[PDB]
Design a protein around this nucleic acid. Sequence first.
RNA 1: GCAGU
Lengths: 1339, 51, 50, 15
Amino acid sequence: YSYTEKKRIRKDFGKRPQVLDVPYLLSIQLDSFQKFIEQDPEGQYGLEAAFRSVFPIQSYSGNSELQYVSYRLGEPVFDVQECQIRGVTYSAPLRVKLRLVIYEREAPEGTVKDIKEQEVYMGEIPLMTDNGTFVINGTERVIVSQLHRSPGVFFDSDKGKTHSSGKVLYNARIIPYRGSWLDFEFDPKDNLFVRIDRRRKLPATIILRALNYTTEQILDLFFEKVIFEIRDNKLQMELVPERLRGETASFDIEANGKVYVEKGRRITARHIRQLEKDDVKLIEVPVEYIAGKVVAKDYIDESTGELICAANMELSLDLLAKLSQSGHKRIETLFTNDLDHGPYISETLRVDPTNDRLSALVEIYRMMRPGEPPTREAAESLFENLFFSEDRYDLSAVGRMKFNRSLLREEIEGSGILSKDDIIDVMKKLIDIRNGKGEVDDIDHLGNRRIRSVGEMAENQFRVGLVRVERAVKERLSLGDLDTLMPQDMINAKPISAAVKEFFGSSQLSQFMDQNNPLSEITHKRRISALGPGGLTRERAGFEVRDVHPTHYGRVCPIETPEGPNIGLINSLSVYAQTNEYGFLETPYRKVTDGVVTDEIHYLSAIEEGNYVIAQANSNLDEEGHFVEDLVTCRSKGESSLFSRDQVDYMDVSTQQVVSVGASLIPFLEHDDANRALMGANMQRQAVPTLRADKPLVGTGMERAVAVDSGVTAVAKRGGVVQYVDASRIVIKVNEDEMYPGEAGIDIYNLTKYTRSNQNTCINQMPCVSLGEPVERGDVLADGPSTDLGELALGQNMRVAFMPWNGYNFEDSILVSERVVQEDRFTTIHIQELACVSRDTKLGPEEITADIPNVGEAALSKLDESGIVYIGAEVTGGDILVGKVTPKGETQLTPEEKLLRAIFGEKASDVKDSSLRVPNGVSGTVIDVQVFTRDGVEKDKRALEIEEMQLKQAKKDLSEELQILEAGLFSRIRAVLVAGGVEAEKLDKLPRDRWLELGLTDEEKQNQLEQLAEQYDELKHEFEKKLEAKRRKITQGDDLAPGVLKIVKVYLAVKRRIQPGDKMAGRHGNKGVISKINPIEDMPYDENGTPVDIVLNPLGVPSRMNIGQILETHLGMAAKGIGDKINAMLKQQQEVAKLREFIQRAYDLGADVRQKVDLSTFSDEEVMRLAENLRKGMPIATPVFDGAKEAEIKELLKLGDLPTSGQIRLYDGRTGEQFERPVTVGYMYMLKLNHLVDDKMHARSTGSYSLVTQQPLGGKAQFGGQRFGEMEVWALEAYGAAYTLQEMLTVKSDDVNGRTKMYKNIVDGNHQMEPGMPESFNVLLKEIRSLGINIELED
Amino acid sequence: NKLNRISRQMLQEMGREPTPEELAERMLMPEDKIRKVLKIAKEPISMETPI
Amino acid sequence: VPLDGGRFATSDLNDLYRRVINRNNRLKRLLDLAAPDIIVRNEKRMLQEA
Amino acid sequence: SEIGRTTDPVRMYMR
RNA sequence: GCAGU
């Protein structure tokens, strides 16, 4: 079966056999950054592509060149953990091998004079840890992926949003990856207009004249010509028949045969069929047929050299009789059939003022740089650098692909710059769409919208840095010292490092990691964000980008999204969702070849998802594969309908394909409303890890995937046997099958003990395996925070009853019994670092000392002689943690305290107490103290003590891992030596250091002895190489901020118990604040006396229709009911046959469930270990949308001898009398969310005030003051509370002379105010007067 | 300016930001003078900087 | 105001006032030096925009 | 001419 | 920026 998952097997109620296992959930981040940093030979991705994009850098003249050979990534100076402790970025140095090639002065082809190649250093790039996070200035950050608009061309419209006339106005838009936007559009009178960078619009033919097209070439491109070969007969007209489609023929058509349609009729396609079947191509038209027709060619008089008719000029009868004198047989004319063809280009050329290339370039220049006089070689360089220069415009590979795919070209690859035919084809497709021959694009289709991830954004910022360097190198190669300099005298690392640094630290998408539980991390890494640089802004994003498109099915979760202002802008990647090679989300589907649903899987993106018919995952099918129903529900084009079995092309790969990893953990998701499911998926990510992790009795089976794919747990890399288990480490003796030759064969796993998360929780790894037991590859070795035997345990299985209890659960409140506080269920450890920074003031240095002025001697009891607290010291609020004093001067005390000094003689001290104290309300244990001392500052006794502790710990850990590895190497040597020439009773006496030089006869295994001895010697060498480095990193100085002398960081560990106010929740959106902690004897209780742990409200179920929280309860009653039977069989010490029988009955139960747990193969010891793990309730798995039916829940309730209705009779704890109706009692999985009332409660009487305005400061960190804002002032104005309002304005915020008087009056027993003018009004009168305006106060 | 230039060259030759106690020995000024110069060279933050 | 970390924190008004006074003292300088009209016109425009 | 088309004093200087 | 109401 397994070994870690037959300790305790979760009974699966899933019924559809899974075809694709859930992928590695963090492969988005890791695959993206791997594509960024790794070496690319062909130069397509990451750093190699960014170097080849810029290099070789040629000089302005061409005498020297700077080319790029290769790059390398250095070794990071500090480990991940050393970067988290020293508060520095975990990065790697970028060592680029450059080459300066210099020629002679006059060379034939650029023949070289010298080549100077060397390894320049340009910046450090932050490395990504093996869990997808970045350690940047010590904090772990996640660069959230971005859903942005794919580069390409997009045709769209406004649906009569303009001119109030119902005329849809179309617009094409070329969006490059990097470059300038290019818009074409139709105005309400069908004139094509162009815009660049969304500035004011030109006529669209101005850009056609910027290209070298003349007017007749423009009309040749955008039209087809009708030709009048004016024969003897009046205007003998050449004709193709289909031009006659759908118009009111007021002229008759006669050509050697019938008069086809009489004058004054509209003609139909059968008339065109008639004209093409009798084969007439040359007809006779009336004379006025040219009146209105627009000429196509520039008709000139060869007699006089004068153009008698310009192109795009409306031919008339007088002008026709004019040019007919010149002897012109053929008259070309633009064929404009209304409602099939447009005058748009001709009526556009009638508007623009330009008639040649230079005038159009000048008009584009006046559009672009207005008020600057345009010259020829300035305008004709501006236009050529807008769209057609490969360094100022990039329609990238995905942009070129989408561009060619829109215009229906055959190639997917091309150039990154625009061309003549690209712009012509965009205008042509826009005109086609205007003529009804196409349809506008959907801008929020997930095939018009793509994923830009950490490894692409980082490459973009690195390329920005490289071009900031390229400009400087071009400014440097234009000098005359080119014969003495090396390429590292030209490269400033600060541009590159500053670009990469600001992206990784201070971007909108590089976010402080949400580290509450494993789920918070694993769903912050799978985050998609429409916001960010190059995306939307949450204030200007409409209702339509925030919607659930039909193309999010399988690519983006519909449920998991925020609830505030950015909803639908922050999305969560669904479970099986993947990215294309271009960044388009694709999702897997099983091919259905002939009705047999093949287990072959194909990842379809959103554009190719609509060509097919795709069956549901809920579609029934036999073992053969055919759909047993005959009308399968499928998705054809974005709409859903029933199809025959033969039409179906693909099928969903799973039922949790559509929901994210956060919403796939909600059991019975199919019974909750989508609002409540959204709230539950958002509130699971806020649960804090409790002391002892408790698995869900009702889960969905995704617990193990979420707990393993997040790096919170310790997973065995190679299988083996646990050689040594300990709360701080696990030592695994690897199996002989899995160890390489020349290797100790021992894996050591050092566990994270009691460290601070980003959200001040405790992350702490507990060993799961026992000593000597066998482990496999992939088995969870040590739990993490919120992890129970490798499953994801975000909360505790509290026994709930749904009944109203005396109003204490009114309006979503939670009644909690005292046995939840007794049993320490939702007690959570929280770790806070507090920093005491001894700085260098200008009056002198602040010192960390224990002789603090005017403080008690009992307050300094917990400080050591160096002024710092002891480790293990139980501190409460106000206690001094780090004793510090700042030197002060210029006292200038008032005469009364001067006399007070004269009488008693206590002379004031020159120093001020600035020590670090525990914040009020916080009470915990000091668990760590770090002292960072600036180099040159002498270390106090505590810093030297901490350093000797660190050196002893480093030396002891390195020596212990060397002892472990060398013991494994010697065990392997002993195993090899007894494989042939066995000295097993001679080798036990020979000491271990003598076994290397023991020559064995060399059949083959002497090569093994060579490699093991070499491994041992290099292990001994590496131990010293690591120990000296650890010693020099410990005893070295710290690179602190300038001005600070030392920093003492005290790590408090608080234990927050549950209390009224703490927000608790379930997985189904049923949040609630604890309103009372009720005694055990006050709770309702069943006929056996078991009281109820938590009493929830029935009224919170039916209106917000989260029925899942009922079924989870009814099934959690069933699960625990199984456990309460196994526990009973474990108390009577029943034989293992009866336990095996009952556990097999509990695992066999269900209607054609997909799992088979056969306990016939379990040994009796494995059955007993399983039954001991199941005595607290059998964990049940209800997968999302194929989970447990209500009939199966009732069958499980019958198995555990429970009432199948899920409802028992309770009795009141206080009065002992039975509640009149049966109450729903069961086991709901409750979560303690991170909104704790300890961190919410805050109050001030007075305190620090603001600087410019004298109002109180902001928040509970700055001691607060509540904003009595504008709506509350209207509330006090709606009552007649004029004095309450006045004292809220004057003597509580701003009346500086008035609030001190108010305090002294409240103290002297006189509740009276003397309000003056608020200081903000004086600030306002002084700020209006600093404008040229005289505002006054009259009297 | 001399300090920034020298630290620029030192970063280019040794691949890390030089300590003031080696920045002070590539220059010939005392180390505390380098420390006060580094304390001086900072520009004031704007009070309208969003947090 | 000096922040505790040794760095200062100013309002944008000091930057704008300092720009005004720099351009104004330079305009008084140019008017004393009898600069050409192109330079003093550009300086008056800069003072107006500051 | 270009008089009155711009507001940038840099452009007026270059003009 | 990210959450809570």
